[PDB]
Amino acid sequence: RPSSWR
Amino acid sequence: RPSSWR
Amino acid sequence: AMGSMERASLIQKAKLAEQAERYEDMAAFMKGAVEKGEELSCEERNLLSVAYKNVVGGQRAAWRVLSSIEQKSGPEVREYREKVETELQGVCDTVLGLLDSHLIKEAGDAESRVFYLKMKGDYYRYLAEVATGDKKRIIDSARSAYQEAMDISKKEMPPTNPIRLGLALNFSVFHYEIANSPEEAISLAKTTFDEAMADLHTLSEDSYKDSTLIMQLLRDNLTLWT
Amino acid sequence: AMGSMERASLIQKAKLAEQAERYEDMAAFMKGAVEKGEELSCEERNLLSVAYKNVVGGQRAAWRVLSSIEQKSGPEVREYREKVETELQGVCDTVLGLLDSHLIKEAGDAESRVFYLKMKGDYYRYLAEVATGDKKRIIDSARSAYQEAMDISKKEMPPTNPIRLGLALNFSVFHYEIANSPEEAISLAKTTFDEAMADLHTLSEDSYKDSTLIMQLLRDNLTLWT
Ligand SMILES: [Mg+2]
Ligand SMILES: [Mg+2]
Ligand SMILES: [Mg+2]
Ligand SMILES: [Mg+2]
């Protein structure tokens, strides 16, 4: 799972 | 805060 | 709302909800299972307890944050704390209602009856945490439930039994935090710990792990309190 | 349900709900604030985004757990995955509805219009994650929203602007995970990172911290992908 904005 | 059962 | 679902499907979905960390769903599935009117197994009782403990635990944590903000202080913080409070009370009343209709009266074995009376004590304790209005009658209701549970546990269960241990742990917390009885709390935790320690020699490796985990919670409290 | 509460009180309660980690409440408060019909400030937009991202994030995580169990496999796992799926779709449709009625059309400044179009892309992306039935039209809706946002951002915002960065990050994720375009994803992340790096010299210490945080997410993805 890649990072989306958080 | 003390520990209750968990 | 769960009247049309099979009991077994409700239990299966409670387990799935647990894996998914969907505790509101898990509680609703287990409420539905209880309302089928059959007694609950050990595993099922634990699913019921885990579900509601997680739901009410989140409510309690939020209530504490809001109460702290309110203490530091328009009507909004009080209004919202009251909203969360009412929602918490509702969950506690729902659990107590399941215990009263009719889990406790159908529970004859010590393991089930102690489990349910501990739950009854716990949910009155949560009601007591937010009470200001009959705080005393709520506190007495918790005490009575815990006391009945403890009397059965001491007669019917070994001192290492995990439910007996968890009951004593939570009744000690009740004394320390609710009843303003820190000496009773410490006494209870110490006696419980020492009597369990003396009975560990009777256990298997797996039972030993179960009992010593809860003993460590008693110790953690005694460390905090002394 | 929030029609009777003042806008300012809704915003105040959204902040309290955030502090209490009550994200469902926070989302409902912010939905109510949006439905007052006034534009939202920067801070308010962020409250709206945080609320719904936390709600849908929990749903997405649960959906993934259930979908994994279902893949490994009576009707119960599929039924429950479908229940969580429908609830997720409902939240996405609610957000998209707020954006369409009427946040996007009233957003004239680049900061607000890009913010809302990024949100539109994100919520269609979440719909795409669970779609099997018009997956293609959902995917195209996400793409179009992200593309409009990117065209504005490139014209109107510096390459270090945090909303521009977060948009590019999420559009890159869209390419990698949804559109089956890993090369486009990597290209976009790399160009975004490099153009931001070249513009850091213009920033204050605080702005630099903001931009470099999001750049590190672009880098984390490039590390995972290459
Ligand atoms: Mg049946
Ligand atoms: Mg019986
Ligand atoms: Mg007004
Ligand atoms: Mg405008």
Numbering used by the authors:
A (entry chain P), B (entry chain P): 124 to 129
C (entry chain A), D (entry chain A): -3 to 69, 78 to 137, 139 to 231
Pull text from the paper:
MG1 stabilizes the hub protein 14-3-3/peptidyl-prolyl cis–trans isomerase NIMA-interacting 1 (Pin1) PPI. This small molecule forms an imine bond between the formyl group of MG1 and Lys122 of 14-3-3.17 Notably, 14-3-3 is a dimeric protein with each monomer binding a single phospho-peptide and molecular glue, independent of the complementary monomer. Given this independent binding behaviour of the 14-3-3 monomers, the crystal structure of 14-3-3 is depicted as a monomer. Aldehyde-based molecular glue activity is initially regulated by cooperative non-covalent binding, followed by slow covalent ligation, further enhancing stabilization.
In addition to the pH, the reactivity of the aldehyde functional group is highly influenced by the electrochemical properties of the electrophilic small molecule. To investigate the electro-donating and electro-withdrawing properties of the molecular glue on PPI stabilization a panel of 2-ortho substituted benzaldehydes was used. Structural analysis of X-ray crystal structures of MG2–6 in complex with the 14-3-3σΔC/Pin1 complex showed all molecular glues shared a common binding mode to MG1 with an unambiguous electron density map for the ligand. Analysis of the crystal structure confirmed FC-A binds at the interface of the 14-3-3/Pin1 complex similarly to MG1, however, does not form a covalent bond with 14-3-3. Notably, 14-3-3σΔC, which is C-terminally truncated, was used as this mutant simplifies crystallization and is highly homologous to 14-3-3γ in structure and sequence. However, stabilization was not solely driven by electronegativity, with 2-Cl (MG5) and 2-CF3 (MG6) analogues eliciting less stabilization than 2-Br (MG4). These results showed that 14-3-3/Pin1 stabilization is driven by an interplay of molecular recognition of the composite 14-3-3/Pin1 binding pocket and the reactivity of the aldehyde.
